[PDB]
Amino acid sequence: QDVVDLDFFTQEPLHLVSPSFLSVTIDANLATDPRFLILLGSPKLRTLARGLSPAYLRFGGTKTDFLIFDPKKESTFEERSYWQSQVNQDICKYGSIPPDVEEKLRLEWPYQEQLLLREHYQKKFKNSTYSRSSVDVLYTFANCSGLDLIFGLNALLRTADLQWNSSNAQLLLDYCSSKGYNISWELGNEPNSFLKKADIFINGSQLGEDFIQLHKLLRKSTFKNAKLYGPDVGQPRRKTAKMLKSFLKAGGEVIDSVTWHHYYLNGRTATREDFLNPDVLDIFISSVQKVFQVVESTRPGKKVWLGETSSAYGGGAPLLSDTFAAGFMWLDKLGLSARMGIEVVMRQVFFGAGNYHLVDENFDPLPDYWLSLLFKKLVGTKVLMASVQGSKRRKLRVYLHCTNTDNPRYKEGDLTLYAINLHNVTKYLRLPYPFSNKQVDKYLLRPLGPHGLLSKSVQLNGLTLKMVDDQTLPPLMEKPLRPGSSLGLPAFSYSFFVIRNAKVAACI
Ligand SMILES: *[C@@H]1O[C@H](CO[C@@H]2O[C@@H](C)[C@@H](O)[C@@H](O)[C@@H]2O)[C@@H](O[C@@H]2O[C@H](CO)[C@@H](O)[C@H](O)[C@H]2NC(C)=O)[C@H](O)[C@H]1NC(C)=O
Ligand SMILES: *[C@@H]1[C@H](O)[C@@H](O)[C@H](O)[C@@H](C(=O)O)[C@H]1NCCCCCCCCN=[N+]=[N-]
Ligand SMILES: *[C@@H]1O[C@H](CO)[C@@H](O)[C@H](O)[C@H]1NC(C)=O
Ligand SMILES: *[C@@H]1O[C@H](CO)[C@@H](O)[C@H](O)[C@H]1NC(C)=O
Ligand SMILES: *[C@@H]1O[C@H](CO)[C@@H](O)[C@H](O)[C@H]1NC(C)=O
């Protein structure tokens, strides 16, 4: 019997996630050679980014702590040409990359990608500078795409006695003020591994003071209510958890949210079977509980954000992280994050080096992009709860929110269920009363074509998802179900279901 009964708990929200719950990163290493930031001038890229608004865009990564703002820095042919062609035109409406520059950067990018990826497993780590032009490219991409920029500041600029030296950051904040930029900030990326990365140990207590120091500069600036997030610690292993704890004791008062990072797997060792294994899905929970214990002990009630997360570290799992099979991890992460109290989840990455990107080297969306877009259109901010009657809840995983009321097909009271089937057979879900005789819109995602779960294309209710063109996302077409039908979920698939006229009081 492949018929599973659902229970729903709709009396009140367990949590309220941010409208920007599904957020994204651009790795700081895209600036290592800043020419490649010009790639963000693509209209195709903007079209795609806009589909994910509202969202935070976090500019940050390992390179965060090896980047230096230099207002005097000299521009390349590519940058001068990009900027010269934007003059006298509405950059958000009409901005594009000169074709010669676009072609040059697309030719160089695979090499650049290899270089950036190898800098991971390289022992050495070098400084680079970036110009005002680089900052401008990033701001305009975020602003034009309806995204909120979070900019990670370099925490390895140090005084003689290992306090954070804030003079470079001050030059940047001055520059951003003078331009009217609405930007939020971080300081440092994964400080827990600064010893490994730079021969310098900063403890959490010291990092707290560096944050307080940065806070004082943001209170002085022309944007007095600029938000500040931190500390962007890695996976909460014991040592990292202790660093977080001491950080929150010292400087937890001045952060608007606590940021930490999570990866399921090592990209070099991950298997296809790891991507489908509910034990691998379940370990994320352990991490979440350890983070909330640390936060509850030190700053109870403080918002908790996943500041950088993906399927696998090291740039992703070759041939796995860019496939339909990557969706189980992504959707389950969002599901669990929402249900356990995480307010924002920042996907590593929207675009850039690695194959855990949502959008590839050709600016084509991968299956996780479409998964993200569907999530964004259907799933509301109020998190409710669903469960499966039985003890095989490991392989049939179910989440329930109020329906996104910005969606014009639906209304207040409506419910959005999403579910993951990791069994190797079809399962059929029975909705509970009073949702057992409603019109229900199915949104089932399945891999296209011979590679199956390892495919990089996906269908929505039997229809291939593709950009209509560079300016235009397609409609996402529902499949109406017969009222009172069970909800069919094929083997190794995931789906959304919108329960229309559900009239849930909590969703109003
Ligand atoms: C398919 O999965 C089963 C385990 O899942 C159960 O059986 C499915 C057919 C379906 O009825 C699900 O809803 C069930 O939850 C695999 O069999 C297990 O394999 C493991 C690991 O090899 C073994 O240790 C267990 O003893 C097996 N359990 C059972 C109940 O048979 C089966 O091999 C899978 N089929 C494949 C990979 O083709
Ligand atoms: C986050 C980082 O900021 C990004 O710049 C990287 O591209 C990204 C990635 O690896 O893809 C990510 N780095 C996380 C590093 C993972 C550390 C875990 C190592 C565990 C080894 N344990 N021991 N001992
Ligand atoms: C990077 O630059 C800063 C400031 O100039 C310096 O203190 C730091 O040691 C440099 N690190 C490397 C690896 O070059
Ligand atoms: C901080 O850095 C600036 C810019 O490099 C340097 O000129 C200044 O002396 C440093 N201050 C301290 C206290 O180290
Ligand atoms: C943290 O670092 C400071 C100096 O930066 C040091 O004096 C202090 O003892 C350290 N505290 C702990 C708990 O390690």
PDB file of all heavy atoms in Angstrom, residues 89-103:
ATOM      1  N   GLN A  89      21.462  56.029 -20.506  1.00  0.00           N
ATOM      2  CA  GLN A  89      20.483  54.995 -20.683  1.00  0.00           C
ATOM      3  C   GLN A  89      20.095  54.478 -19.325  1.00  0.00           C
ATOM      4  O   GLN A  89      20.894  54.425 -18.422  1.00  0.00           O
ATOM      5  CB  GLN A  89      21.061  53.872 -21.553  1.00  0.00           C
ATOM      6  CG  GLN A  89      20.054  53.341 -22.570  1.00  0.00           C
ATOM      7  CD  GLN A  89      20.645  52.291 -23.508  1.00  0.00           C
ATOM      8  OE1 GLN A  89      21.530  51.515 -23.128  1.00  0.00           O
ATOM      9  NE2 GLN A  89      20.137  52.244 -24.734  1.00  0.00           N
ATOM     10  N   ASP A  90      18.859  54.052 -19.212  1.00  0.00           N
ATOM     11  CA  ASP A  90      18.373  53.414 -18.016  1.00  0.00           C
ATOM     12  C   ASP A  90      18.989  52.021 -17.932  1.00  0.00           C
ATOM     13  O   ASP A  90      18.534  51.076 -18.595  1.00  0.00           O
ATOM     14  CB  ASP A  90      16.847  53.356 -18.079  1.00  0.00           C
ATOM     15  CG  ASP A  90      16.236  52.832 -16.817  1.00  0.00           C
ATOM     16  OD1 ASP A  90      16.902  52.086 -16.050  1.00  0.00           O
ATOM     17  OD2 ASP A  90      15.052  53.165 -16.617  1.00  0.00           O
ATOM     18  N   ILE A  91      20.036  51.925 -17.132  1.00  0.00           N
ATOM     19  CA  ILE A  91      20.808  50.683 -16.919  1.00  0.00           C
ATOM     20  C   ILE A  91      19.923  49.468 -16.519  1.00  0.00           C
ATOM     21  O   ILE A  91      20.154  48.358 -17.006  1.00  0.00           O
ATOM     22  CB  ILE A  91      21.945  50.917 -15.877  1.00  0.00           C
ATOM     23  CG1 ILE A  91      22.862  49.701 -15.721  1.00  0.00           C
ATOM     24  CG2 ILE A  91      21.382  51.231 -14.487  1.00  0.00           C
ATOM     25  CD1 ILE A  91      23.730  49.468 -16.907  1.00  0.00           C
ATOM     26  N   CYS A  92      18.889  49.689 -15.691  1.00  0.00           N
ATOM     27  CA  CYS A  92      18.022  48.591 -15.246  1.00  0.00           C
ATOM     28  C   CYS A  92      17.130  48.115 -16.374  1.00  0.00           C
ATOM     29  O   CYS A  92      16.849  46.926 -16.469  1.00  0.00           O
ATOM     30  CB  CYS A  92      17.186  48.975 -14.009  1.00  0.00           C
ATOM     31  SG  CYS A  92      18.153  49.419 -12.540  1.00  0.00           S
ATOM     32  N   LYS A  93      16.700  49.030 -17.232  1.00  0.00           N
ATOM     33  CA  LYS A  93      15.825  48.671 -18.358  1.00  0.00           C
ATOM     34  C   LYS A  93      16.621  48.106 -19.509  1.00  0.00           C
ATOM     35  O   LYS A  93      16.249  47.108 -20.121  1.00  0.00           O
ATOM     36  CB  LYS A  93      15.095  49.914 -18.920  1.00  0.00           C
ATOM     37  CG  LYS A  93      13.777  50.274 -18.243  1.00  0.00           C
ATOM     38  CD  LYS A  93      13.265  51.621 -18.751  1.00  0.00           C
ATOM     39  CE  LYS A  93      12.236  52.228 -17.814  1.00  0.00           C
ATOM     40  NZ  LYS A  93      10.972  51.448 -17.848  1.00  0.00           N
ATOM     41  N   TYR A  94      17.687  48.814 -19.838  1.00  0.00           N
ATOM     42  CA  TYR A  94      18.357  48.630 -21.123  1.00  0.00           C
ATOM     43  C   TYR A  94      19.829  48.217 -21.024  1.00  0.00           C
ATOM     44  O   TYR A  94      20.466  47.991 -22.039  1.00  0.00           O
ATOM     45  CB  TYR A  94      18.236  49.934 -21.924  1.00  0.00           C
ATOM     46  CG  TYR A  94      16.789  50.381 -22.138  1.00  0.00           C
ATOM     47  CD1 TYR A  94      16.358  51.661 -21.744  1.00  0.00           C
ATOM     48  CD2 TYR A  94      15.848  49.526 -22.748  1.00  0.00           C
ATOM     49  CE1 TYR A  94      15.046  52.081 -21.939  1.00  0.00           C
ATOM     50  CE2 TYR A  94      14.526  49.927 -22.943  1.00  0.00           C
ATOM     51  CZ  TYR A  94      14.139  51.214 -22.533  1.00  0.00           C
ATOM     52  OH  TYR A  94      12.861  51.629 -22.713  1.00  0.00           O
ATOM     53  N   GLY A  95      20.384  48.117 -19.823  1.00  0.00           N
ATOM     54  CA  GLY A  95      21.810  47.790 -19.714  1.00  0.00           C
ATOM     55  C   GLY A  95      22.133  46.439 -20.327  1.00  0.00           C
ATOM     56  O   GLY A  95      21.403  45.513 -20.136  1.00  0.00           O
ATOM     57  N   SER A  96      23.217  46.355 -21.083  1.00  0.00           N
ATOM     58  CA  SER A  96      23.773  45.088 -21.557  1.00  0.00           C
ATOM     59  C   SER A  96      25.316  45.180 -21.607  1.00  0.00           C
ATOM     60  O   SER A  96      25.875  46.215 -21.335  1.00  0.00           O
ATOM     61  CB  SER A  96      23.220  44.753 -22.962  1.00  0.00           C
ATOM     62  OG  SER A  96      23.561  45.769 -23.912  1.00  0.00           O
ATOM     63  N   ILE A  97      25.974  44.091 -21.991  1.00  0.00           N
ATOM     64  CA  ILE A  97      27.449  44.029 -22.117  1.00  0.00           C
ATOM     65  C   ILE A  97      27.787  44.225 -23.612  1.00  0.00           C
ATOM     66  O   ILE A  97      27.206  43.547 -24.458  1.00  0.00           O
ATOM     67  CB  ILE A  97      27.966  42.640 -21.697  1.00  0.00           C
ATOM     68  CG1 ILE A  97      27.439  42.221 -20.313  1.00  0.00           C
ATOM     69  CG2 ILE A  97      29.498  42.584 -21.677  1.00  0.00           C
ATOM     70  CD1 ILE A  97      27.440  40.712 -20.122  1.00  0.00           C
ATOM     71  N   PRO A  98      28.747  45.108 -23.956  1.00  0.00           N
ATOM     72  CA  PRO A  98      29.203  45.106 -25.373  1.00  0.00           C
ATOM     73  C   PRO A  98      29.500  43.680 -25.861  1.00  0.00           C
ATOM     74  O   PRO A  98      30.046  42.884 -25.096  1.00  0.00           O
ATOM     75  CB  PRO A  98      30.489  45.962 -25.321  1.00  0.00           C
ATOM     76  CG  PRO A  98      30.217  46.895 -24.206  1.00  0.00           C
ATOM     77  CD  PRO A  98      29.548  46.039 -23.150  1.00  0.00           C
ATOM     78  N   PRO A  99      29.089  43.326 -27.098  1.00  0.00           N
ATOM     79  CA  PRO A  99      29.240  41.936 -27.543  1.00  0.00           C
ATOM     80  C   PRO A  99      30.673  41.399 -27.571  1.00  0.00           C
ATOM     81  O   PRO A  99      30.861  40.212 -27.324  1.00  0.00           O
ATOM     82  CB  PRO A  99      28.667  41.944 -28.971  1.00  0.00           C
ATOM     83  CG  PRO A  99      28.508  43.349 -29.328  1.00  0.00           C
ATOM     84  CD  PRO A  99      28.307  44.104 -28.057  1.00  0.00           C
ATOM     85  N   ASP A 100      31.637  42.267 -27.907  1.00  0.00           N
ATOM     86  CA  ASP A 100      33.078  41.920 -27.922  1.00  0.00           C
ATOM     87  C   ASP A 100      33.541  41.562 -26.517  1.00  0.00           C
ATOM     88  O   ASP A 100      34.219  40.583 -26.324  1.00  0.00           O
ATOM     89  CB  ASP A 100      33.923  43.071 -28.479  1.00  0.00           C
ATOM     90  CG  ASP A 100      33.539  44.413 -27.869  1.00  0.00           C
ATOM     91  OD1 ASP A 100      32.328  44.780 -27.939  1.00  0.00           O
ATOM     92  OD2 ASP A 100      34.421  45.088 -27.286  1.00  0.00           O
ATOM     93  N   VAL A 101      33.114  42.348 -25.536  1.00  0.00           N
ATOM     94  CA  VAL A 101      33.463  42.120 -24.148  1.00  0.00           C
ATOM     95  C   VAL A 101      32.810  40.853 -23.657  1.00  0.00           C
ATOM     96  O   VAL A 101      33.487  40.051 -23.022  1.00  0.00           O
ATOM     97  CB  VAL A 101      33.034  43.287 -23.274  1.00  0.00           C
ATOM     98  CG1 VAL A 101      33.202  42.972 -21.788  1.00  0.00           C
ATOM     99  CG2 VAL A 101      33.781  44.537 -23.670  1.00  0.00           C
ATOM    100  N   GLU A 102      31.509  40.675 -23.933  1.00  0.00           N
ATOM    101  CA  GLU A 102      30.787  39.431 -23.544  1.00  0.00           C
ATOM    102  C   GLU A 102      31.419  38.172 -24.123  1.00  0.00           C
ATOM    103  O   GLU A 102      31.562  37.161 -23.432  1.00  0.00           O
ATOM    104  CB  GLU A 102      29.323  39.440 -23.983  1.00  0.00           C
ATOM    105  CG  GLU A 102      28.596  38.153 -23.560  1.00  0.00           C
ATOM    106  CD  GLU A 102      27.085  38.222 -23.572  1.00  0.00           C
ATOM    107  OE1 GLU A 102      26.518  39.318 -23.524  1.00  0.00           O
ATOM    108  OE2 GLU A 102      26.460  37.145 -23.602  1.00  0.00           O
ATOM    109  N   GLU A 103      31.739  38.218 -25.408  1.00  0.00           N
ATOM    110  CA  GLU A 103      32.400  37.101 -26.046  1.00  0.00           C
ATOM    111  C   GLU A 103      33.794  36.850 -25.434  1.00  0.00           C
ATOM    112  O   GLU A 103      34.134  35.725 -25.144  1.00  0.00           O
ATOM    113  CB  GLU A 103      32.487  37.358 -27.547  1.00  0.00           C
ATOM    114  CG  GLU A 103      33.192  36.255 -28.302  1.00  0.00           C
ATOM    115  CD  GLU A 103      32.880  36.295 -29.783  1.00  0.00           C
ATOM    116  OE1 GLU A 103      31.683  36.142 -30.143  1.00  0.00           O
ATOM    117  OE2 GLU A 103      33.830  36.483 -30.581  1.00  0.00           O
TER     118      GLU A 103
END
